[PDB]
Amino acid sequence: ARLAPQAVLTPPSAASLFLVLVAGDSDDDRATVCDVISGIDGPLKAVGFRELAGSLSCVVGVGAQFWDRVSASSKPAHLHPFVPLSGPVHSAPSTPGDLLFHIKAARKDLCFELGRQIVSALGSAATVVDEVHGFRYFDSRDLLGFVDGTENPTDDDAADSALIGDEDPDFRGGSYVIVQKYLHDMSAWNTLSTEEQERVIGRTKLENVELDDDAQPSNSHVTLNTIVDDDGVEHDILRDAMAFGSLGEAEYGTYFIGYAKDPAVTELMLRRMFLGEPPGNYDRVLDFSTAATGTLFFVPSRDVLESL
Amino acid sequence: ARLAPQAVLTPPSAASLFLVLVAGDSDDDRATVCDVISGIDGPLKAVGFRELAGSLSCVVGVGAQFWDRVSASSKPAHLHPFVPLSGPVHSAPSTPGDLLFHIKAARKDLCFELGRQIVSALGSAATVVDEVHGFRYFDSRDLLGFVDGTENPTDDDAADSALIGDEDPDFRGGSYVIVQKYLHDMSAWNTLSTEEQERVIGRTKLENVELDDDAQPSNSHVTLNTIVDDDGVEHDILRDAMAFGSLGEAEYGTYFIGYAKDPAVTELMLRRMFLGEPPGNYDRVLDFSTAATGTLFFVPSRDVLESL
Amino acid sequence: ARLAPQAVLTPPSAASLFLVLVAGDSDDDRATVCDVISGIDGPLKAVGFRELAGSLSCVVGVGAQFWDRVSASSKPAHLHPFVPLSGPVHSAPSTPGDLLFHIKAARKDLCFELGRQIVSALGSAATVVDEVHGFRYFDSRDLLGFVDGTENPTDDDAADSALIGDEDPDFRGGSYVIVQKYLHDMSAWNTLSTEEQERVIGRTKLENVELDDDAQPSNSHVTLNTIVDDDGVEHDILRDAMAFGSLGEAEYGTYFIGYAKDPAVTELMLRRMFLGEPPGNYDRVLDFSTAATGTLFFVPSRDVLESLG
Amino acid sequence: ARLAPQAVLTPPSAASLFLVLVAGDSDDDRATVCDVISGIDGPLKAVGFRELAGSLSCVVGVGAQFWDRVSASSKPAHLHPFVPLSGPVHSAPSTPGDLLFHIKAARKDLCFELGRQIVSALGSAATVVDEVHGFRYFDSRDLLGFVDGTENPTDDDAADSALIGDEDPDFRGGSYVIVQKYLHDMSAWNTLSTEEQERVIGRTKLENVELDDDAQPSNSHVTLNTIVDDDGVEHDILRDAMAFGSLGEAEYGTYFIGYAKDPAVTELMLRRMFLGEPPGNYDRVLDFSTAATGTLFFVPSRDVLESLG
Amino acid sequence: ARLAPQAVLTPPSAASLFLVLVAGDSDDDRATVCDVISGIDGPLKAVGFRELAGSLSCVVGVGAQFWDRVSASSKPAHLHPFVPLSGPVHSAPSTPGDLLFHIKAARKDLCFELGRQIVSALGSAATVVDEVHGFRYFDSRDLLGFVDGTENPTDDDAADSALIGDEDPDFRGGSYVIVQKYLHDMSAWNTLSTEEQERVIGRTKLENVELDDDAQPSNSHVTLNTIVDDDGVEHDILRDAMAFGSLGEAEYGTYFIGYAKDPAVTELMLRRMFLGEPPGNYDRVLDFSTAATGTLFFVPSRDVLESL
Amino acid sequence: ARLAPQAVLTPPSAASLFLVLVAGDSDDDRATVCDVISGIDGPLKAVGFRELAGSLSCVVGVGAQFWDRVSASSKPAHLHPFVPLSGPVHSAPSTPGDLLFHIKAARKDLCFELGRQIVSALGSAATVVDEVHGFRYFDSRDLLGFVDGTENPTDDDAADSALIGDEDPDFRGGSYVIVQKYLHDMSAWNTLSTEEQERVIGRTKLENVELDDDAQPSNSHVTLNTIVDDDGVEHDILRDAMAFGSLGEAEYGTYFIGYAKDPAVTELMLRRMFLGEPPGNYDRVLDFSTAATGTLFFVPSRDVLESL
Ligand code: HEM
Ligand code: HEM
Ligand code: HEM
Ligand code: HEM
Ligand SMILES: [Cl-]
Ligand SMILES: [Cl-]
Ligand SMILES: [Cl-]
Ligand SMILES: [Cl-]
Ligand SMILES: [Cl-]
Ligand SMILES: [Cl-]
Ligand SMILES: [Mn+2]
Ligand SMILES: [Mn+2]
Ligand SMILES: [Mn+2]
Ligand SMILES: [Mn+2]
Ligand SMILES: [Mn+2]
Ligand SMILES: [Mn+2]
């Protein structure tokens, strides 16, 4: 899908930019934001066409509250604000955001320039409340040192997992996305042996092979994030996480971003991670990772976005 | 996508070859021509398969007159010779062409070699009347210094704009292509300021951003080439323009090529450009650009081309 | 089709790995094999996701005999062992194989690592009986010096040629694949002039242009592998042959692998090549190429493979 | 110069990292710093060798004050703190820094990982006071939209411009580097027409062609940064500026970094830019660019750096 | 190596531009020409710096006659006009040229743009008399189908063969370059068998292996272009030939360009080729190739070029 | 150093080929081998020139015995056969080899083709006794999972470490190389924890960081292979090791190849590894790696090779 907005199914990229904004209260602010997001193909092409490979993509997400301001009388089935989670040891906050721009390209300059044109076009109508410049780290790893994304669904599976279908026909082709900015405690993480780390994640570290059933702990990240319904059907989400950080501020992060046709799947993963399954048996990744943000967005299809 | 002829929807390439030929009057000439074009998959693969990436593509177009020699009692709805235009200041001529080969690849040698094999196979049955070796110029620019092709429809929009559909079902998947070889007056263009050049085109020069609605002249290239019908529906074409040139002959060119499911769209753009809207309010691009050729071809689907 | 098993339609790659294995006789062995092949997407991603381009692919084939052990009451319409052929001077032997892994990637390490993980997961439940590390050779040439793959069908034609459709709906999207490891007699081939080599193949050597009708021999590789039925309809196969060899053993080979929605097409090509058309007018490529293996496998669709056992 | 520290002459890269740190006051702190910088080839290889192209490089600079703590009785001829400048409306401040790491690579992860390992090895012995992640912007442009670096000297001229030679033999192959982090006023710059911007810089914008003599303003960036001595000899510096920024903070910057065998050249350029020539005829780039830092460092040769302590 | 003019030793490139110009008779013309060529580093960097890889190079050559206008009382030892040759069957003409720009890059646009800027800077002071856009053809082949440039000296050998040394110390680091634009008779060449073609060249065609000593004809291109002196010392030249062509004009060409520290080597090769060794035993390449131009230039070192 | 034989200092490559041969006993065999190796630039260019990047290199090594047959009266200072080592637990055999070809390129086909032409040109005059097709494994790792080559000397250090200098002036520019084909016990290796493995090697596994002094065991691979003279000067070697293997034969290998201007440095490393320092404290890498071959070759400079 070349230089088309709302391309949820794009493969991983070398660079990304995650912009979360809050819209101003006026109707003028509302109208500027609407103009910009609905014509987002304009700047996407203005920047993206300059690269022969045409790698640049831009997914626009709209928060529950803001959606109500621009489409009061027509709403996707599962749009609501992000549900805060308060677990026995760790919590996932719900933090502000009216707009998400999830931008990816083969090159940092293309991300940066697209962001520059979007922010400039929004002017005073919106404020950036979170900004993360994601980068690929070695062979698709996160800063914990593990290959991150391995089990993503691909092709038809990706589309079945992430894209709204017959269950909500007026919003077919759309999706729901959750973001969380995580910061890691690297020194604590490095006190663990590699084997302890593998038991936390659920895969071997260098080789990125899922641990055997009989060595797979019940609170591993993989176990807690495997969602199987009563008919034995697995329900997957599409993740585009990227590393980020700042060396001077000792910040080493993983920007989580996950797409699903029904956000309850993602929400259940989060509940199982933060509260545990069974309750108390929580994800030991959270012993080394703290979420600074937590926001849910509806991702309209191109058609719906273009007519807002 | 790989190594199939009539692939109208291919993204922009580093190199291009445009060959326009006239066929011989005789029945033997018609027969050779018909053999070469209906078996064009042969040379396409003979050349294209030698490159791992398989970037080589070849679109064959057939003029109205030659189409009648070769497919007498079956014709696409809108196939007719290129309509010449005689405007208040500038004119677009209608020049000969029975065959078009629009060849693209990541490399020049691939273009040249495919060209060489097509020209050799045709032998005395056909004569090259126009030959242009197109090249990508910096970040997708034309020799006027502007990013050229930015607003092209992509994905579904590209297929809806370029490819014949339900409306003419015997020729579904075909297209109509117009070419015009433009020569620029570089020294005249260079006497304009960047800002005046921007007013002529409709977009900022370095940054490739569409001028604000309030700043957009009504005779800008962008305005005159925007086609909106009575119902408020926009109609687009798919362009694959490339730069070409000769330093010794001081020739600096843009080779225009545009595909549409209905040439009425392309032709209306050309009228607005050359005649003006309102009349005499013509495209100031034409003050620095002169069309040396002008030819319309029908682009059969792969299936229709192969049975001929 | 990014990192999905059974991607029969993937374009040519720089590196490939062909693994042919025989499964152990026990119920335990069969169960381990079933587990590995129906979970093949696991190692595929474990390895493939580490490369940004996601070039890695893996096609699993299952032999007729093994298929009956693991899906006794549901079988694609044309699954049978490779049919051997014997001409007077050249033969196409039928050699063992229950499992095929046809692995492709932009890089050798990716093919090797995926092979390593698969072999490791199978452990004592299967034995490697053939292993070939294929490599792209110049501009898509085989070791005879000819561009090899030129006329492969692409896109819709590739899908129409290779994949089971309405004729056998329970296995739609599957395919039948035949492999033959050919070893070349390089010094005999080198005694021919270029023009003689071109008459053997049916295309010019450097330029890879098909010889025109009047110049195309009735026993050229191209002529005998052209299949036009009574109704005048052409039937194609999808090939992904690669060069392989060992300098010290003097082995210079072409690993033939051809996919078809119905192996009758591939089998008729082989009959024409080895037995000739008219009878005895065989394919002279076989004067310089000797098949050391010959095996047929059913390639199930993803859904069918994942459901196994 | 593959994976060797102090490679001042490396060509432009897609990504860079500029780290400026202040060393702790203790003997322990100094010793840890000494250990890390004189062993810098260790982390350089640990990270860089993982990339086949070996694009990663790392130049270590040491401030005048820190230098005296760790090599009290041997000092290059021109090592002194950055000399601040104050014009009537624009100033070049002198800001803290004992250590510079100027890291470049084809990829961001390589710069980041090397920075991570260096910061980690220094631990509490040094503090990061400036950190900039530079990136190539289109066709070698800065965020003002101009090609930035065009006239850099190359090969022998680069070596002649940047590296200490016979004038100071104990430090042959070293250099002096100045950094300034500039932030731009983008909306003010955008109020200029292209032609006005070109008169500010001294070259055409899209085409990056130097304005001819009759059209070149006496206060253009190019004119004021052209240094021709009394004898008519030109003196150049080697620059490796990169774009950087933050959209939410509205920070759009150029990180200036310039190497010279004698910082007098760079210092005279800065005087001309900030104070003007003739006096008051300053560089109008400064109307749109404000320096937030200003620091000078000695870049020792490999041999000198490795020998430290 | 990067972006410095007069880089004779650069490896082969994907694209090339050969510009040969004659200068105006006047003193103003001489002055402009002298300004452009002595400041050629300017345009080289203006263009070349825009490409991260910095592949762009430009070698300036000056003909004997123009050199005398511009450096009257100081001349390299072997600078004289191209010596025409009149052999038993084939002839090599001596055509005009004051200036040569031999431009190479990984991309055509870089070549074209540098060319455009040089031609513009020269304005009316000089006229393009020959222009050739060279391109790499498959695996380093010429349009005769043979790998072209195989035996080129590399590294120290390339410097010893091409660059003026101790023997003429005022011009150290300079070179002498000969160009000839050859046009092929493709249909005649194609009537030879591969084996006969191999006998003509001196090497196997696909495999690019030198024929066995016993199988190597004495009139092969390889034999006639091997120069061994009395002492048994071989003398080599550095060639940078490129294919060029026009399909409509049926022009298939090899642009020959050869650098030597002493043109006596190149000239002897040309005599052996055109006159034969023994006399009349000439290069059978010349039966399928006709030289349309022939010009000799001195290539000053960077230092000598810049003070002029 | 482009397409030049005996390029010892080339950086790591994606592919390599290691060919070890024994020459036949006749004087005819001796003469054929001499012809081939001394003209090795012929096939190097015949194959290498076909790749634009020109990555192909070929280093020829000559064994002690064979050298005596072709240069009986002139010998480099340290040429002798490989010294077998018999340690408390492991041994390094000395195995046959008259010729080494160490071939590297960006592509397997270039290695293979060069090898093909060499073996063909040697015909019956020599027999291949060992053949290994090396490949790059992920981010420069060996099959033990560790980055392999990290501490290689580079630039001036590489030349000082590997190339014969003033100490043996008649062979300046040459080198000495040792090869050992190692096969690993992967199952035994994988019983170790990552931390145990790191203590065996002397560096962290994923991060490839040398262990601290106080955690660096005295029998680690790194400790045993660090060679410091009595003046505190370290003596380094240049290694080009590559992974190889065969999945059907359960072969997972590391082909060791190491260059030094004085092979005593390499030999001392081997003694310390196999016998231990102090005696008995041997390299625990050898508990998981067995050397199947062991051969020493002299690497002549280009000049010396070309005049054999
Ligand atoms: C001298 C020849 C021409 C030049 C140099 C030229 C240049 C450009 C440029 C720079 C743009 C803006 C970027 C973009 O592609 O969106 C553009 C847009 C366009 N041009 Fe042209 N053009 C030429 C001829 C033509 C002709 C002959 C037609 C129609 C028959 C045409 C149709 C268009 C259209 C439809 C657009 C998109 C406008 C929009 O919807 O925003 N152009 N052209
Ligand atoms: C020694 C092993 C073989 C070699 C070296 C070889 C080589 C080639 C070459 C050079 C071509 C022409 C370029 C192309 O279109 O691919 C070709 C075509 C072909 N080969 Fe093979 N081949 C081999 C074995 C086989 C076998 C066993 C089959 C069938 C079972 C086969 C089926 C084909 C087909 C169908 C074509 C396409 C012919 C056409 O429709 O134009 N080949 N082969
Ligand atoms: C806001 C920060 C700056 C920006 C945006 C900037 C931009 C540029 C640009 C666009 C050029 C022309 C292309 C080129 O040759 O590089 C240039 C040239 C140059 N700049 Fe800067 N510059 C900055 C700061 C500095 C500083 C602080 C110095 C000196 C200390 C400097 C020294 C130079 C030099 C020496 C040249 C080469 C001029 C010539 O010889 O033609 N620049 N700069
Ligand atoms: C029609 C124009 C020409 C063509 C098509 C052509 C083609 C070739 C070919 C295919 C080779 C063998 C591969 C290699 O480069 O080593 C070659 C070699 C060579 N050519 Fe040319 N050539 C042409 C004109 C010239 C001219 C005019 C000269 C000298 C003035 C020349 C000098 C050489 C030399 C010195 C060699 C290397 C021979 C050796 O030492 O092995 N060529 N040429
Ligand atoms: Cl960004
Ligand atoms: Cl072309
Ligand atoms: Cl493999
Ligand atoms: Cl960084
Ligand atoms: Cl050009
Ligand atoms: Cl190999
Ligand atoms: Mn799972
Ligand atoms: Mn529009
Ligand atoms: Mn056919
Ligand atoms: Mn200047
Ligand atoms: Mn020779
Ligand atoms: Mn060490």
Side-chain angles (χ1 to χ4, degrees), chain F residues 187-206:
Chain F
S187 36
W189 183 243
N190 301 330
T191 68
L192 269 51
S193 67
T194 295
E195 296 69 33
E196 290 166 332
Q197 293 181 358
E198 293 170 341
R199 277 184 254 106
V200 171
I201 298 299
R203 312 183 64 94
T204 55
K205 187 185 202 176
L206 175 60

Side-chain angles (χ1 to χ4, degrees), chain B residues 135 247, chain E residues 16-17 108-109 111-113 131-134:
Chain B
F135 60 97
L247 303 171
Chain E
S16 227
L17 172 61
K108 197 249 208 297
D109 64 342
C111 292
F112 186 86
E113 176 65 14
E131 176 177 5
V132 164
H133 306 296

Side-chain angles (χ1 to χ4, degrees), chain D residues 12 136 139-141 147-150 152 154-157 206 208-209, chain E residues 1-4 41-42 45-47 49-52 113 116-117 302:
Chain D
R136 184 182 163 71
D139 49 324
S140 327
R141 294 185 186 265
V147 181
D148 190 313
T150 304
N152 269 319
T154 58
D155 67 83
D156 287 331
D157 312 69
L206 174 54
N208 178 42
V209 181
Chain E
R2 71 142 36 204
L3 305 171
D41 53 288
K45 294 171 168 176
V47 182
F49 194 83
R50 301 169 68 178
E51 181 203 32
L52 181 51
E113 176 65 14
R116 183 188 79 74
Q117 291 178 22
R302 202 157 81 233

Side-chain angles (χ1 to χ4, degrees), chain A residues 156-235:
Chain A
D156 290 340
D157 286 352
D160 298 340
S161 303
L163 299 193
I164 295 163
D166 295 328
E167 77 284 357
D168 193 4
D170 299 346
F171 297 98
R172 179 191 313 279
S175 192
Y176 300 87
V177 63
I178 286 168
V179 300
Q180 299 180 112
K181 180 167 75 182
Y182 284 90
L183 295 166
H184 302 292
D185 188 335
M186 297 299 308
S187 36
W189 183 243
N190 301 330
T191 68
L192 269 51
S193 67
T194 295
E195 296 69 33
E196 290 166 332
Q197 293 181 358
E198 293 170 341
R199 277 184 254 106
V200 171
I201 298 299
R203 312 183 64 94
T204 55
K205 187 185 202 176
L206 175 60
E207 308 84 359
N208 177 220
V209 171
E210 183 178 337
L211 260 22
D212 303 327
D213 293 356
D214 71 355
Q216 184 71 79
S218 74
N219 60 350
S220 74
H221 188 78
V222 164
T223 297
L224 290 173
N225 285 135
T226 298
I227 300 302
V228 176
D229 69 24
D230 287 335
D231 300 329
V233 181
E234 176 174 314
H235 301 275

Side-chain angles (χ1 to χ4, degrees), chain B residues 56-98:
Chain B
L56 189 61
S57 71
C58 185
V59 173
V60 178
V62 185
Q65 287 181 124
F66 188 88
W67 181 268
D68 289 335
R69 295 176 63 180
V70 106
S71 178
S73 38
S74 181
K75 212 170 99 194
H78 309 298
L79 179 51
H80 54 262
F82 177 92
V83 187
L85 292 178
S86 225
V89 176
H90 298 294
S91 280
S94 183
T95 60
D98 296 322

